[PDB]
Design a protein around this motif. Sequence first.
Motif, mmCIF file in Angstrom:
data_model
loop_
_atom_site.group_PDB
_atom_site.id
_atom_site.type_symbol
_atom_site.label_atom_id
_atom_site.label_comp_id
_atom_site.label_asym_id
_atom_site.label_seq_id
_atom_site.Cartn_x
_atom_site.Cartn_y
_atom_site.Cartn_z
ATOM 1 N N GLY A 129 -1.469 -3.180 5.012
ATOM 2 C CA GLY A 129 -0.329 -3.230 4.079
ATOM 3 C C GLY A 129 0.643 -2.242 3.739
ATOM 4 N N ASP A 130 1.422 -2.350 3.128
ATOM 5 C CA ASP A 130 2.664 -1.417 2.994
ATOM 6 C C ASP A 130 1.821 -0.129 2.127
ATOM 7 O OD1 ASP A 130 2.140 -2.963 0.663
ATOM 8 O OD2 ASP A 130 3.863 -2.473 -0.239
ATOM 9 N N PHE A 131 1.990 1.004 3.238
ATOM 10 C CA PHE A 131 1.563 2.353 2.882
ATOM 11 C C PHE A 131 -0.030 2.379 2.830
ATOM 12 C CE2 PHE A 131 5.804 3.031 1.637
ATOM 13 C CZ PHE A 131 6.071 2.090 0.674
ATOM 14 N N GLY B 251 -7.468 -9.248 -1.239
ATOM 15 C CA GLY B 251 -6.527 -8.148 -1.087
ATOM 16 C C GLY B 251 -5.893 -7.591 -2.096
ATOM 17 N N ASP B 252 -4.839 -6.747 -2.045
ATOM 18 C CA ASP B 252 -4.001 -6.065 -3.019
ATOM 19 C C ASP B 252 -4.849 -5.599 -4.179
ATOM 20 O OD1 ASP B 252 -1.506 -6.263 -1.888
ATOM 21 O OD2 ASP B 252 -1.755 -8.555 -2.040
ATOM 22 N N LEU B 253 -6.134 -4.825 -3.932
ATOM 23 C CA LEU B 253 -6.961 -4.138 -4.737
ATOM 24 C C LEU B 253 -6.207 -2.977 -5.485
ATOM 25 C CD1 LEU B 253 -10.669 -4.364 -3.052
ATOM 26 C CD2 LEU B 253 -8.866 -6.122 -3.774
ATOM 27 N N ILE C 237 -1.856 -11.683 7.585
ATOM 28 C CA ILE C 237 -0.697 -10.463 7.446
ATOM 29 C C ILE C 237 -0.625 -10.171 6.036
ATOM 30 C CG2 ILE C 237 1.168 -12.281 7.244
ATOM 31 C CD1 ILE C 237 2.816 -10.180 9.128
ATOM 32 N N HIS C 238 -0.150 -8.837 5.782
ATOM 33 C CA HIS C 238 -0.034 -8.530 4.237
ATOM 34 C C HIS C 238 1.023 -9.136 3.711
ATOM 35 C CE1 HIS C 238 -0.352 -6.219 0.819
ATOM 36 N NE2 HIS C 238 1.079 -5.859 0.858
ATOM 37 N N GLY C 239 2.217 -9.116 4.442
ATOM 38 C CA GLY C 239 3.177 -10.082 3.857
ATOM 39 C C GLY C 239 4.553 -9.218 3.296
ATOM 40 N N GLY D 125 -0.456 -11.679 1.682
ATOM 41 C CA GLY D 125 -0.704 -11.007 0.149
ATOM 42 C C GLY D 125 0.472 -10.564 -0.309
ATOM 43 N N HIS D 126 0.343 -9.256 -0.555
ATOM 44 C CA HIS D 126 1.681 -8.591 -0.891
ATOM 45 C C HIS D 126 2.333 -8.943 -2.665
ATOM 46 C CE1 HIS D 126 4.570 -5.514 -0.571
ATOM 47 N NE2 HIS D 126 5.787 -6.635 -0.789
ATOM 48 N N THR D 127 2.363 -10.285 -2.927
ATOM 49 C CA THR D 127 3.193 -10.502 -3.831
ATOM 50 C C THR D 127 2.095 -10.520 -5.043
ATOM 51 O OG1 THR D 127 2.519 -13.062 -3.897
ATOM 52 C CG2 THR D 127 4.509 -12.269 -2.683
ATOM 53 N N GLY E 9 -4.950 -6.589 3.000
ATOM 54 C CA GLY E 9 -4.759 -5.021 2.852
ATOM 55 C C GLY E 9 -4.475 -4.649 1.514
ATOM 56 N N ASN E 10 -3.869 -3.532 1.372
ATOM 57 C CA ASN E 10 -3.847 -2.928 0.081
ATOM 58 C C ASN E 10 -5.129 -2.553 -0.728
ATOM 59 O OD1 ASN E 10 -0.264 -3.808 -1.351
ATOM 60 N ND2 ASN E 10 -0.894 -2.151 0.487
ATOM 61 N N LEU E 11 -6.093 -2.253 -0.020
ATOM 62 C CA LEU E 11 -7.369 -1.730 -0.510
ATOM 63 C C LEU E 11 -7.188 -0.234 -1.170
ATOM 64 C CD1 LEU E 11 -10.179 -2.474 2.052
ATOM 65 C CD2 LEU E 11 -8.898 -3.957 0.219
HETATM 66 MN MN LIG Z 1 1.843 -4.542 -0.822
#
Ligand SMILES: [Mn+2]
Length: 183
Positions: free
Chosen positions: A62-64, A8-10, A86-88, A115-117, A39-41
């Motif tokens: 993910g966020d946004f 994630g977080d691409l 969960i995105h996180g 993810g997220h971090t 998420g965060n693709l």
């Molecule tokens: Mn994020």
Amino acid sequence: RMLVLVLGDLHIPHRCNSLPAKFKKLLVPGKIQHILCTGNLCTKESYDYLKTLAGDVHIVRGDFDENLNYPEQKVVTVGQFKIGLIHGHQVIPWGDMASLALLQRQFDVDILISGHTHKFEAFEHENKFYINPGSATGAYNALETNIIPSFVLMDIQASTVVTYVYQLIGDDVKVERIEYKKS
Ligand SMILES: [Mn+2]
Ligand SMILES: [Mn+2]
Ligand SMILES: [Mn+2]
């Protein structure tokens, strides 16, 4: 035996134009049964890419992230494992007991993924496994620029999961192998 891609977080295209070439060399259709994406693709392009790798693509928002049809959290079953995703970037108020009660569902899994971090973690604790696959594109987060691009493959068989963490460390691809067995 099931092979699971966890990434994630691409953040394509806004922090990265694409997945590291050395990572794409490792990912071919017809190998992976499931993809779990934190998420965060940040675009349908990436989702389409992932769908070329496997049919069963589970992704959370993910966020946004633009898509609304992405659930915020899910619990998936693969083999004998309940996997929570969960995105996180939720970061829940404790004092809100109702939301807390709902969270029970997410903590009560064999394998927790978030993810997220953009920082990778994997470890077993009390018969559960915790994975943060970090950023597959090594995208920067708001805290630092030098993020080691990484993702995870899980080979799942019966009550055993072998987790392979891939990291692009400079020139090379490094792999750590982490075994997790449920009792
Ligand atoms: Mn994020
Ligand atoms: Mn991110
Ligand atoms: Mn164990």
